[PDB]
Design a protein around this ligand. Structure first.
Ligand SMILES: [Zn+2]
Lengths: 106, 57, 65, 55
């Protein structure tokens, strides 16, 4: 009893993102993908904006370099997986209120 | 921070409640520290007299 | 999100002001602007218990062996 | 019911009082406080009063 692998896709397409417990975002929120083609591997960066906040996520390069994440979609009935390499991105969300500051001194 | 502390441990009423006292209590004391930058300004501003870094920072 | 007796803003994750204390039938976040005391309202309860330590006794000692 | 109502009448915070009169196995009473009460560690308060009550 072992599951067979049907297909593997090796180039950027799907991504995975860590967020606060409760992230839901607008029905239309958009996620900008980036690709910093750095030497051997391309460290990725995600960036989005909404009406109040803007969310930016990135990979933990020193842990990214030592472990790599893969996501696949399996069908029980076709015994087939469409494999996708996906970056896991630890994303933080800043708001418009998070962009105000005081004087440079007292 | 909550997920950082309790995580999957959502069942510790002991910890859920102490942590509600901590986070809600901080929200009580400093309602105007709304983002990290303001907080940093409060720490630098409140210790600038003692870190000997003056107008130089 | 609501956890235990904490309810966090669903959009921004801020531990928004408790529905029980709002001056409206709908409060909002201090980071973003979401509507909550108005939407789903919660029924905040916690089953708090003793740590099974505060109450030493000979009878507890007869319960421990 | 007269006991519970009388104890409410003796104490400003308490609301209900159900007692296992069949043995004494538990003592339940409901305490209601205004929103303005914010937060306390009620378990810890109970513990402290438990070690301060003497039969
Ligand atoms: Zn919020």
């Amino acid at each position: 009893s072992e599951i067979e692998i049907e297909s593997v896709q090796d180039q950027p397409s799907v991504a995975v993102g860590s967020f606060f417990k409760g992230f839901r975002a607008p029905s239309d929120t958009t996620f900008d993908l980036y690709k910093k083609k750095k030497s051997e591997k391309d460290e990725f960066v995600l960036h989005g904006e909404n009406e109040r906040l803007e969310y930016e996520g990135y990979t933990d390069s020193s842990s990214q370099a030592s472990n790599q994440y893969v996501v696949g979609l399996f069908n029980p009935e076709k015994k087939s997986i469409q494999l996708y390499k996906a970056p896991v991105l630890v994303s933080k969300v800043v708001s418009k209120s998070s962009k105000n500051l005081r004087g440079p001194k007292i | 921070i909550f997920d950082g502390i309790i995580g999957n441990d959502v069942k510790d009423s002991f910890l859920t409640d102490r942590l509600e006292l901590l986070l809600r209590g901080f929200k009580k004391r400093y309602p105007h520290l709304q983002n990290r930058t303001q907080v940093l300004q409060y720490l630098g501003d409140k210790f600038r007299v003692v870190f000997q870094a003056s107008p130089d920072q | 999100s609501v956890v235990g007796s904490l309810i966090f803003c669903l959009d921004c994750g801020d531990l928004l002001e408790n529905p029980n204390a709002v001056l409206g039938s709908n409060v909002e976040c201090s980071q973003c602007k979401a509507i909550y005391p108005k939407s789903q309202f919660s029924n905040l309860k916690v089953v708090t218990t003793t740590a099974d330590d505060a109450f030493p006794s000979s009878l507890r000692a007869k319960k421990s062996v | 019911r007269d006991r519970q109502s009388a104890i409410i009448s003796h104490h400003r915070f308490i609301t209900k009082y159900n007692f296992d009169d069949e043995s004494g196995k538990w003592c339940e009473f409901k305490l209601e406080l205004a929103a303005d009460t914010e937060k306390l560690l009620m378990v810890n308060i109970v513990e402290e009063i438990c070690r301060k009550s003497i039969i």
